[PDB]
Ligand binder design. Structure first.
Ligand SMILES: Cc1ccc(-c2cc(C(F)(F)F)nn2-c2ccc(S(N)(=O)=O)cc2)cc1
Ligand SMILES: [Zn+2]
Length: 256
């Protein structure tokens, strides 16, 4: 029954998921003066023009836009990555207030939200196998700040009323995730983990330096979602972020 509450939130996860205290947990604080520029890094390749979204789901923890990953349609390559990683889903983490909500922090700065575009290494054939491998996943993380609206997010916002509560889903076809990306693909990268249970240490993190701007209205609609099931006492889906974890034996590399 893990969650983000006082009795089941991040500080409790290690009891069911002891890897929570592991050597390469995420998220982390990105200390920008200590991150090392790596000329080894090759440019990141985000090829999302053939993405096929399927559905959107409230899973009690966040909302998730799921894609058809049965062919090489939307993929991430280059950067720190070897090979091809297929987009399977994206989701967000966000706050109760504009001053918190991201998982990663930048020089301890918290953003209003963070977008995770989740990809799996096609060398492992499926996502479930990939999560058992140290190089199984690549998650592209993109910060959200509140300011101007992001037009490409609006189709997501407008379907949230149909998936208010835990377990609700809806058709969500022809959504183009390119509309969620900032101009710059300058990034930080480090080896880490899933930021929710099971907290598996399978992720190459790629966190973009440039945030996207979303409007207050757009994020306010995120905060009207519910963690609870239909006909249960309302618990607003807010502050579904894990705090920064110890960096331990890792170096964050910068592409710029
Ligand atoms: C809609 C949806 C949501 C989650 C999952 C999923 C499953 C699993 C696992 F490991 F159990 F298989 N993790 N995991 C998952 C994926 C990404 C992250 S994150 N926040 O690090 O990007 C954290 C957990 C799949 C689909
Ligand atoms: Zn996430």
């Amino acid at each position: 029954h893990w969650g983000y509450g006082k009795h089941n939130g991040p500080e409790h996860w290690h009891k069911d998921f002891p890897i929570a205290k592991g050597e390469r947990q995420s998220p982390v604080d990105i200390d920008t003066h200590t991150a090392k520029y790596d000329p080894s890094l090759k440019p990141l390749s985000v090829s999302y023009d053939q993405a096929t979204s399927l559905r959107i789901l409230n899973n009690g923890h966040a909302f998730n836009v799921e894609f058809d990953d049965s062919q090489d349609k939307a993929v991430l390559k280059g950067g720190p990555l070897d090979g091809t990683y297929r987009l399977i889903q994206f989701h967000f983490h966000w706050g109760s207030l504009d001053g918190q909500g991201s998982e990663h922090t930048v020089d301890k700065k918290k953003y209003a939200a963070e977008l995770h575009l989740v990809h799996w290494n096609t060398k492992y054939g499926d996502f479930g196998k990939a999560v058992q491998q140290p190089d199984g996943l690549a998650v592209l993380g993109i910060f959200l700040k509140v300011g101007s609206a992001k037009p490409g997010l609006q189709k997501v916002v407008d379907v949230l009323d149909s998936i208010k509560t835990k377990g609700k889903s809806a058709d969500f076809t022809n959504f183009d995730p390119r509309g969620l990306l900032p101009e710059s693909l300058d990034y930080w990268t480090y080896p880490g983990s899933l930021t929710t249970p099971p907290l598996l240490e399978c992720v190459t993190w790629i966190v973009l330096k440039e945030p996207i701007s979303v409007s207050s209205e757009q994020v306010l609609k995120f905060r009207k979602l519910n963690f609870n099931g239909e006909g249960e006492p309302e618990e607003l889906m807010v502050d579904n972020w894990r705090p920064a974890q110890p960096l331990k034996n890792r170096q964050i590399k910068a592409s710029f």
